[PDB]
């Protein structure tokens, strides 16, 4: 990339192509700084600027590696909050992406694979740094992601009902019931487990849920 | 056409083709495809004014050791047993002791071909195929097999005197550790880099002395097919490791008299004090018997794939695997003659017997050479 040069010449150009929006060139000097000078003083700020440039270059695992680098290069730091934000923020963006947004089609019943990994690091941020400069938006993601995982968990709780595996209905709803205290999908998975109970003659256990539906009528 | 499949790393050829004396053949008497470019420890012996000549195919000849004319011939290709009609496929070479020609076959069969007709005057299966030609002596058919098992068979009937495992490498680490019996002790070298002495009476280990490395975690040369046949100059064993690293060592104990433990020797003879040998570069070097101090050398067969060095017609004769023959000076390394009697190659040790010098080339088979 950029040879063994003055580091600040490599650093400012990295900042320049960060300022340019030239993320494919921002990494080209940000890495070639830390390729030649990983021991640089702003090389940890380069690491956060790499996570800035990788995400802006859509390099989510390379962001994560630089997130893991700033984990490994800085095992204790007040910019691990970023690293704990941006790993989940990677894993927010790592999970689902399609063109069907303008068509109003949503992937929250898609596999929340990194959306599982997003809920960790966002909450690990708002556990590990619940006062930092990343707690606010991550808590928004987590509140949004709790239903997304639930709407995924709704989709299997949906699917087994028309599949008619009524033991598989209730345990998906129970998995929604045991996990989500607040998601409306769990409020509407509520009669399905009740119906599957009434399919499995657990009408009385379903009238428990009918009382819960009476309690979750509001 | 063939300007593109090219990928080869160099072997050094034969320089210095000098005929100070004129060489020739004494005659030419070919078997067929004999010792072969196939790597085989078949090798013709010469005795009784009889070219006891052979091949792995089965033809057991006897030609005259005056002009190569057929004294007797049988063909002793194999017959059946889990597959019918194999060639003879000789692992051990020709050993003519008494009225038998003892030849180890690659079917782990050692024979005794009756020297009047080459009929198998006894056959005995041994402990794996013969990595050494059968040293048939003292009532024993002493063989260093492929598994390193020292056979001893009663050479009148092949009745097994014993079978004892020798210096045992990790595989067929290719070295002829041919069992020489010295002072009542069957002294053997080793393809596992050690040198032993075993009892000639019953196969009891007199000692075993590690000399140098064999293959495996000290990965050593695979051009040093070692003369781990020991030449015990009476009190001092002269033999190699598996890498070629020469030593001199005690007969009774194996205590190192001296060593040339850098010289990865391939072939060697203790020619008086003047140890003529084949260097690791296939080169010729004369050494002392005291540290192996170089008495003279020759690089005129640098990496040219030689046979063992021999003195015949007064000069150091050697053949190569390229059909050339080389009358090196017994002084500092000069070709006194060069004969290319063959192109098929030689790896046979040149048998300066019956007054003649009889070899079998690989497929340009048995030739007798003089100057």
């Amino acid at each position: 990339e950029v040879p063994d040069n003055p580091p600040n010449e490599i650093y400012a150009t990295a900042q320049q192509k960060l300022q340019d929006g030239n993320w494919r060139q921002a990494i080209t000097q940000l890495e070639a700084l830390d390729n030649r000078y990983p021991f640089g003083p702003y090389s940890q700020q380069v690491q956060l600027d790499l996570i800035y440039a990788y995400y802006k270059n859509a390099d989510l695992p390379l962001a994560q590696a630089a997130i893991d680098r700033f984990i490994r290069l800085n095992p204790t730091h007040p910019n691990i909050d970023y690293v704990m934000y941006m790993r989940g923020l990677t894993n927010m963006a790592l999970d689902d992406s399609a063109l069907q947004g303008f068509f109003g089609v949503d992937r929250s019943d898609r596999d929340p694979q990194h959306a599982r990994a997003a809920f960790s690091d966002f909450s690990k941020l708002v556990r590990g740094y619940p006062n930092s400069q990343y707690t606010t938006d991550a808590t928004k993601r987590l509140v949004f992601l709790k239903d997304r995982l639930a709407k995924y968990e709704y989709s299997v709780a949906e699917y087994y009902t028309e599949r008619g595996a009524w033991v598989a209905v209730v345990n998906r709803v129970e998995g929604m019931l045991r996990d989500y205290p607040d998601t409306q999908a769990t409020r509407d998975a509520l009669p399905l487990m009740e119906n599957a109970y009434r399919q499995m003659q657990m009408n009385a256990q379903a009238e428990k849920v009918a009382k819960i539906i009476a309690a979750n009528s509001s | 056409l063939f300007n593109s499949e090219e990928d080869v790393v160099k072997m050094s050829p034969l320089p210095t083709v000098e005929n100070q004396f004129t060489p020739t053949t004494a005659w030419s008497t070919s078997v067929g495809s004999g010792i072969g470019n196939f790597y085989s420890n078949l090798h013709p012996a010469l005795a009784d004014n009889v070219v006891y000549a052979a091949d792995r195919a089965g033809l057991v000849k006897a030609l005259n050791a005056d002009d190569g004319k057929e004294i007797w011939s049988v063909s002793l290709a194999e017959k059946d047993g889990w597959f019918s009609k194999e060639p003879a496929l000789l692992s051990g070479g020709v050993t003519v002791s008494g009225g038998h020609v003892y030849i180890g076959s690659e079917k782990a069969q050692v024979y005794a071909l009756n020297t009047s007709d080459g009929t198998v005057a006894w056959q005995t299966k041994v402990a794996g195929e013969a990595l050494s030609r059968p040293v048939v002596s003292d009532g024993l058919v002493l063989i260093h097999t492929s598994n390193g098992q020292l056979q001893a068979l009663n050479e009148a009937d092949g009745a097994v005197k014993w079978t004892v495992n020798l210096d045992m490498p990790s595989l067929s680490l290719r070295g002829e550790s041919a069992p020489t019996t010295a002072f009542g002790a069957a002294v053997v070298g080793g393809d596992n880099g050690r040198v032993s002495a075993v009892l000639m009476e019953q196969g009891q280990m007199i000692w075993q002395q590690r000399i140098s490395q064999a293959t495996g975690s000290t990965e050593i040369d695979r051009l040093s097919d070692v003369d781990t046949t020991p030449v015990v100059v009476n009190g001092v064993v002269f033999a190699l490791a598996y890498n070629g690293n020469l030593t001199a060592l005690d007969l009774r104990s194996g205590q190192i008299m001296w060593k040339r433990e850098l010289g990865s020797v391939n072939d060697f003879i203790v020619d008086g004090n003047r140890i003529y040998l084949v260097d690791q570069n296939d080169r010729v070097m004369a050494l002392t018997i005291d540290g192996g101090v170089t008495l003279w050398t020759q690089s005129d067969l640098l990496h040219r794939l030689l046979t063992s060095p021999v003195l015949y017609n007064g000069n150091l004769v050697v053949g190569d695997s390229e059909g050339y023959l080389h009358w090196i000076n017994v002084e500092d390394g000069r070709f006194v003659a060069q004969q290319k009697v063959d192109s098929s190659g030689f790896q046979t040790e040149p048998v300066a017997a019956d007054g003649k010098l009889l070899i079998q080339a690989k497929d340009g088979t048995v030739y007798s050479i003089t100057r």
């Binding site: 909450s123 990343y134 808590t139 607040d182 | -």
Partner: protein
Amino acid sequence: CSSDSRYKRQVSGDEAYLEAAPLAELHAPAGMILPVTSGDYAIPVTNGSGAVGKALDIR
């Protein structure tokens, strides 16, 4: 060449997670009691610095 991105983006993305989906707590009456929250579902509500969305602080 021609003025849209000239070699480049307007590639599809997502932003819905900052919207923080409104979630109404499930109520269980007496005798209907199961542990309603398990798993990693533990969100410490902290509005410490930065804001919603991209108004969170960015380095």
